[PDB]
């Protein structure tokens, strides 16, 4: 009966974020509902040979939602999803948003240790994975959950076996009966993001409809997405970078099309880029380097690329300058975190800004502090610890009041651990990490 708990923004901040237009109090499904009304037959997802229109995506995720509702899964319930980079991932995502099930998307690279940690934390009644994944190749993991009174009520499986509930079977057919369902309320939790760089298992980050949709809508505008955008999704679909900054969600928000890749391997990616005339991609520096090593041989396959986001790790100026020279597309640098704050270089920034900085916050109401060890602000220019709060930055990890007291100060700034300096033009330079 009780919605998943989380740490709320103050009412004065919530009102402000509504007054500014950031929070519009719509569920994340808004992206899909609006696309369906404006352009139902535009492509939403390209995945191998498949083409999913906006309305196909809408129908398929509604189907799964009705089947989960039929089974008693809804508001108050949680789900663990571990899917590879395929269209089913987004059908499942929009199905759980529609049903009011708070979902944690594990990384496809996560193994038993992490999944066990996640299951113990959110006690999901729904588990969705793939039989092709190492963990579900047999039934030992699924069986172990019973031994700890932690079995889900329902397990759905991609590449299922006969005795399994087939994920595609629950997606292709709506439920026989009708049960009502609805999203969690817009200022309540929609799903769980996962921390990056945390010591042990990644910590759970509750994200509400309001704050996630805002960061999606604002990123989309800042990266110039429109209905012609075709964005390669080669990083892990669940990752904050690939899902929302601007990510698949940002492209759906703009009415465009996401184009799937299993991973960033250059030759397969180059092929997909040529086959579907991909014009945007988002990569971490290690993958950029892999593409740089092969781009000259395949200039022709990747010509249609227009814009590359790069972030997630150190990206020195000398590498950045190769992007336009070798990959033949504009560069956009980003520095974000699944906890909230996302920075982009702007499309009209100077070349020095794009090449030597990681940009500036999405929102004019992102508040930044850069502090020393005595937590006093450093003089402009100097290196400090980054602390931040804003209309899409969380207020605390799930069920972690001890840790939360350590990484938030009295004014509820979040201390991300990143070291940064603010350049004279106003942009940020990510310079290292701190314990
Ligand atoms: C835009 C962006 C870039 C990097 C990350 C990250 O977490 O590494 C992110 O969340 C968002
Ligand atoms: Ca189709
Ligand atoms: Ca639009
Ligand atoms: Ca190009
Ligand atoms: Ca961090």
Residue numbers in the entry: 3 to 437
Passage from the reporting paper:
The V336A mutation that expands the binding pocket of BasE near the C4 position of DHB, resulted in a ∼13-fold improvement in apparent kcat/KM for 4-fluorosalicylic acid and a ∼76-fold improvement for 4-methylsalicylic acid. We first generated a casting of the binding pocket of WT BasE and compared its volume to V336A. We observed a significant expansion of the pocket near the region where the valine to alanine mutation was introduced, suggesting that the methyl group of 4-methylsalicylic acid was better coordinated into the mutant binding pocket as a result of this extra space. The V336A mutant bound to 4-methylsalicylic acid and the V336G mutant bound to 4-aminosalicylic acid were used to compare with the binding pocket volume of the WT enzyme. All three structures were solved in the P212121 with two molecules per asymmetric unit. No density was observed for the dynamic C-terminal subdomain, as observed in the prior BasE structures. Next, using the protein atoms from the refined structure of V336A as a search model, the structures of V336G and V336A/S247C were solved.
Acinetobacter baumannii produces the catecholate siderophore acinetobactin to scavenge iron, a nutrient essential for several metabolic processes. The biosynthesis begins with BasE, a standalone adenylation domain, which activates and loads 2,3-dihydroxybenzoic acid (DHB) to the phosphopantetheinyl arm of the PCP domain of BasF. Adenylation domains have two subdomains, a large N-terminal subdomain (Acore) and a smaller C-terminal subdomain (Asub), which is highly dynamic, adopting unique conformations to carry out each individual step of the adenylation reaction. Several binding pocket residues were identified within 5 Å of the ligand, including Asn242, Phe243, Ser247, Val336, Val344, and Tyr346.
